[PDB]
Ligand binder design. Structure first.
Ligand code: HEM
Ligand code: HEM
Ligand code: HEM
Lengths: 154, 154, 154, 154, 154, 154
């Protein structure tokens, strides 16, 4: 293939994690909506769409490199049963995403696939943003209490 | 739970097929784009998005009925290696979708879940449309030849 | 020089307090934002910008009077560790600002620098407004409780 | 000079390749137009202009670094005599561009000229895009036949 | 903290230099205006605002990494007494900025904080732009003479 | 071939001079910009683009006449080291351009290639305009002095 095989394999790992995140965040969105917590339903939906866009770019990059995108398998979904637990499940997932993306950055650099590096660098910045937003929600549950926090996210 | 357990379980079967169809069709879109056959890339993307909307509607219906939507599992993706084979892989997938939807209609009717029936009846109408479109593409390959057919779908 | 030396020196005292207030308020803004308390982040940003405009007006007045604006030095920043303490740190800072401004008004009047007096009198009016706003926030924390107060300032 | 001499020398190599590509793609554009294959005439023109823009940015970067941009010499032009051969000649050229750009990225990194690195990283992404487009045209000539392919590019 | 401690410390160094540059350029702006050299007053103001924006992004990045932004201290201000000397003082300052930013890029890379790296890479590009503009003004004073140069910058 | 071989060969001589002029003028533009003399940067850019359009028209004319445009070779670039020398280098280049164009007009007339003659006659009119502009700049340097002249072209 035109691309580096090891780079292609790690891009498929990143895709695996994006595919997993799409489904986790999407179900979390619809669970929050079913509960009437509509603003967190929206935030989870937006991040699900963001993950879908990430996956699209990785698939297209893998195909350009003449590799085979792997959409057949998923990782473990972390599904919470109440608001605070959902947030902690998302935190667990985004940390997995970031670790995989960081290793893709490091590997692309070593193999001199600089365009791939910049692609996953762009995704990483957004994953840090979602991690930050989740951390903030946890702290706010601490500051205002879970009853006030949910009320605010209706 | 408020909904019927067998109806709930068959809705998760329909969701499984939609989630699987999402990934098959989306990959086929990007492969057609990778091959330079952009009108088939676009058609496949549109059908993937429709499957995404179908899955959304089913997830929301399962949650209202107080069941647990299952997004953890995926079926076999039928991935083609050239234009004609891709179309045949899609035909195989939509036939699986339609069969699961038909059993959901029949079962929803029996259990007097008339609102679920109407939801899955609407999805069925769209699945028949995609099936018809695929049949037409295969016939057109026969009528005009694969070289003219691909040329037309650039 | 064309201006009065004591007036010039007290204007640099006012500038010192504005420069210090810029940094305290700006950091408090970004800390509130980091905590998810965005309306207090916004209020603190607005007051930092006002302090930036105050400092600008004083610098321009010192230069017209042919003195040397001193931007090299900073006072103690009072940095809080939670919402209520931040507000109290700001109250301490604005009280220092107002005291320096009041001495500038009194001294400008004595030395018949009536244009400088009016400049610092305008700044004072705005500093009293920020002081009033801070007092109100503290009272509101008392009336509604810190959990409701923070919830409201998200 | 303010810049690193070795970095400057490699930037002049990249410029050499951009200057060469401008002329190859431009002549190919006008040859396709002379043949009546106007859509490939347009694609070659757009890429010629893109190469001109690349050259502009490299020249300006070399001058900022206090080096001497070398516009006096050109590399070998690969000029095809029929559609498929033209595409293969462009593929040969873009591969030369990318190799020179990749070595510029690697060298800028080692010498800690991070702004130069980002400049050539941006160009590289576009060169990969043109390489991809060319690969696609070759495959389409395979899929639809050269007679249909040219017809489509009129 | 979630961030790397050494990266956080170097980000605080970059902030230190941005805080210093804000004040130097701002005073230089108002000094040029006091002298009637309004176009250089404007250029210094714009760059002061640019430095303020740089500082904002670094503060927010430090807080995201769970570090403590240090706004309490400033570096030495280089304040000129006539047009050419002001420009040379700014040149001294921007070189300090760039050295600190380059070491932040190198350190972020080593510790695999790739989003921080991209943030300071973006700032660096702008600092090179201001350095270039300053170099140009010095040369123009050489070409046209200081009397013509100031006249032009009124 | 459909065109006259000697006419075809002289058209390639004109193209050679345009391609050479493109590069000289474009570099002069970016050098003037690098020096802060932006109105001369702009004037030189405009003349480079005109030379690019001239080269395009000649390439298209050679191809219609079924000859082979030669873009592989370049003449001596006359690169100045200061404003006055640059202008003199441009004067030398446009004089070469005009001489090649004049021989193309005379030869096209002899061989009754009246359409080619009119094409090169139009280009000549524009080359005389650039020659006139350059002469004016040199005279203006004499009338106002180089320091005022450069000041005016900032
Ligand atoms: C499996 C990999 C998937 C990929 C690559 C993918 C890709 C995309 C893309 C590219 C878009 C358009 C984004 C935009 O234009 O703003 C989109 C939209 C959407 N996706 Fe997905 N998607 C995936 C899975 C899913 C799943 C599993 C669901 C539901 C559980 C879903 C639900 C949606 C919805 C509801 C939309 C909005 C469509 C619209 O309103 O137009 N997606 N997806
Ligand atoms: C000390 C760190 C500072 C930071 C982080 C900071 C930050 C900012 C920011 C983020 C803006 C808005 C920029 C925009 O939206 O375009 C701004 C504007 C401004 N700053 Fe600062 N600033 C600082 C210090 C100063 C100082 C010391 C002065 C005066 C000597 C100053 C004078 C101004 C002025 C006059 C404006 C324009 C405000 C307006 O017209 O809306 N700043 N600053
Ligand atoms: C040799 C190095 C060259 C450089 C750095 C260069 C640079 C440029 C630039 C910066 C533009 C404007 C792009 C834009 O604003 O969109 C341009 C336009 C153009 N160039 Fe070049 N160019 C070069 C050579 C050539 C050559 C050799 C030709 C012809 C064979 C050519 C033909 C054109 C044409 C036809 C245009 C469009 C101008 C217009 O319609 O405004 N260029 N070039």
């Amino acid at each position: 293939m035109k691309g580096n095989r090891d780079v292609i394999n790690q891009l498929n790992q990143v895709l695996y994690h994006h595919l997993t995140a799409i489904n986790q965040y999407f179900l979390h969105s619809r669970m929050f909506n079913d509960w009437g917590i509509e603003q967190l339903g929206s935030a989870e939906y937006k991040e699900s769409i963001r993950q879908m866009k990430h996956a699209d770019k990785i698939i297209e990059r893998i195909l350009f490199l003449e590799g085979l995108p792997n959409l057949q398998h998923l990782g473990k979904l972390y599904i919470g049963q109440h608001t605070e637990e959902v947030l902690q499940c998302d935190i667990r997932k985004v940390k997995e995403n970031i670790e995989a993306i960081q290793k893709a950055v490091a590997l692309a650099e070593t193999e001199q696939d600089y365009v791939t590096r910049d692609l996953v660098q762009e995704i990483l910045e957004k994953e840090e943003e979602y991690w930050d937003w989740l951390d903030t929600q946890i702290d706010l549950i601490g500051s205002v209490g879970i009853e006030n926090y949910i009320q605010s996210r209706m």
